[PDB]
Amino acid sequence: DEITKKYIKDNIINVDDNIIKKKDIFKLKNENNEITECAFEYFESKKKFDDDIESRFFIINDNNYNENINLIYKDIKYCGLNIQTTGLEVFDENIRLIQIAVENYPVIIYDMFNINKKDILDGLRKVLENKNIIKIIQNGKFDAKFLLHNNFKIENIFDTYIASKLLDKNKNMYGFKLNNIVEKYLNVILDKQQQNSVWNNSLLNNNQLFYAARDSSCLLKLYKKLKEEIKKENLHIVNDIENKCILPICDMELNGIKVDLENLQKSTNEILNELNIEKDNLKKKLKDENINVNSQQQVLKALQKNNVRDISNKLIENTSDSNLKNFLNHEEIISLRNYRRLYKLYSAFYLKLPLHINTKTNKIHTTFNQLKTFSGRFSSEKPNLQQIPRQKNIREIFIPNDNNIFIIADFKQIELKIAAEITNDEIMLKAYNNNIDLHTLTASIITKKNIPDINKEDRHIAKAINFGLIYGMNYVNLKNYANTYYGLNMSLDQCLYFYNSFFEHYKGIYKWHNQVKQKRALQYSTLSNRKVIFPYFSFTKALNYPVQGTCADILKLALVDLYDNLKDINGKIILCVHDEIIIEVNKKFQEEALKILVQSMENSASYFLKKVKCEVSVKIAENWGS
DNA sequence: CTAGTGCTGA
DNA sequence: TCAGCACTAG
């Protein structure tokens, strides 16, 4: 039909009319700073949209290309960037459209599947690569991944999703989509009713492209309002750190971590054989061949039948971990706990990892979020690399690529040092400046011994108590935390003495607790001014948000600096979990990468914390579990 | 024979 | 998060 092929030469198919090809004379400055009149071709919606957002759009392909269109990019400061892709997986999908939105101009849509002259993208590469031009994106991680994977270099970025998330102060988890944000801040409905229309086809319908253009032009007005809103709330530091942390995260996701298939198979066979042996032993002990070991009620009934009792001659009724500890003087329950451990490992990690390794490259690629967590720390999904077992044997599976070497660096006592800085405790700072660990100090003041005499067990009691009480746990509740997560058995009188002694000397933390509990404020802030508003008062969250948020800020600034400092030796950032950062470098640059990483982490720590000097433990490792 | 909720730990 | 196990419905 002639109506549907009116603009087929530009790879546009007309569905419901509502499209007109119009030519107008534009005014632009030549490279020599001379106003040169140029005539372009742009498409417009025949039926005007009720909103004020821009809807005109160019389309640049192999034939329609005009050399003077690059004059739009000259002497700009912000540009709206949005890309449409054939699918979500970066490795199995290509980029369909690149969209650049420039103020008081139509959006420029690059038809990637119909571009073959590499000079067509010459100006796009410069406008993306320039550090003085701010690129506005929605969910910038996705677009940055897709652009970097396709040999585009992107340097500056301003994610409207990040600004919207920070401004809401973690009040709501859902929302924060382009329609929601634009409705909230501009009072305009984008009509995002496109149900993920077909993009793989070379021809694209009218409504698809007009939805694409309005999703890009609206980012300029959102930038204008959100910049002022961030400046008003003094969130510019956190916003800048987060925006610059997009590229490190995308680099981590693209690089991934390699998996040794041979060692993985060997470990899987060994663990499965051990599981079978333990299952047979438990079957013999439970005296029920048909019993399903995994069934909770069945094992409860079996143990009840066998009549394993307490020291108080009390029978078990729940197989929770805390309950199982009380009953340990029988072989049956020991075998049951061992089997539970083995089964948890086998069914959580070994059998689940092969679903995540890509056979095309033999690597695990993770999805890193940076604002879903309440504290602000990174969170990983699909393969939850934070949920990997911490045992040395398990982590030995992960290895660097061929002809490379890992460099693992992690902070020491970062939460405690941040707490000392924020609360301004007189004694903690003076201790740290003399090179004594706060765990050692806590152990010494508890045990009344001098610093040299502290053993490892006292250090362990200190490790429990310091993390226990800094976040406001009551002395009664210290028992459960100590026994559950460290195995120490403590008498409540001993806990009372520990609490009194701990808060008698560290005056700063006591004053901090008193102020936070007296004020009962609903708004809290970190040292990067990342603000959060809780629905109601929560003492533990109140005392925990500042330190952990500042730790997240320190790690993010470290990644931002490290990504720039590693470009000389082609280092690859692989992972960032807890207070740990992993980078792979070639074996020739083994020595320099260590100094680069140490300097980056130390500068990041010293930017925020000023009283205390942070130290980093770095080791050159052949594999993760070294 | 397939669907689910509802409930219990690792 | 993640897995798995008794109890309603055709």
Author numbering: 1 to 626
Task: Recite the paper's sentences.
Overall, the apPol structure was similar to the previously reported structure of the apo enzyme. We further classified the particles contributing to the consensus map and could resolve them into four structures (global resolution ranging from 3.8 Å to 4.1 Å) corresponding to apPol–DNA, apPol–dGTP, and two conformational states of apPol–DNA–dGTP complexes.
Apicoplast DNA undergoes reactive oxygen species-mediated oxidative damage, and since apPol is the only polymerase in the apicoplast, this enzyme is anticipated to perform both replicative and lesion bypass DNA synthesis.
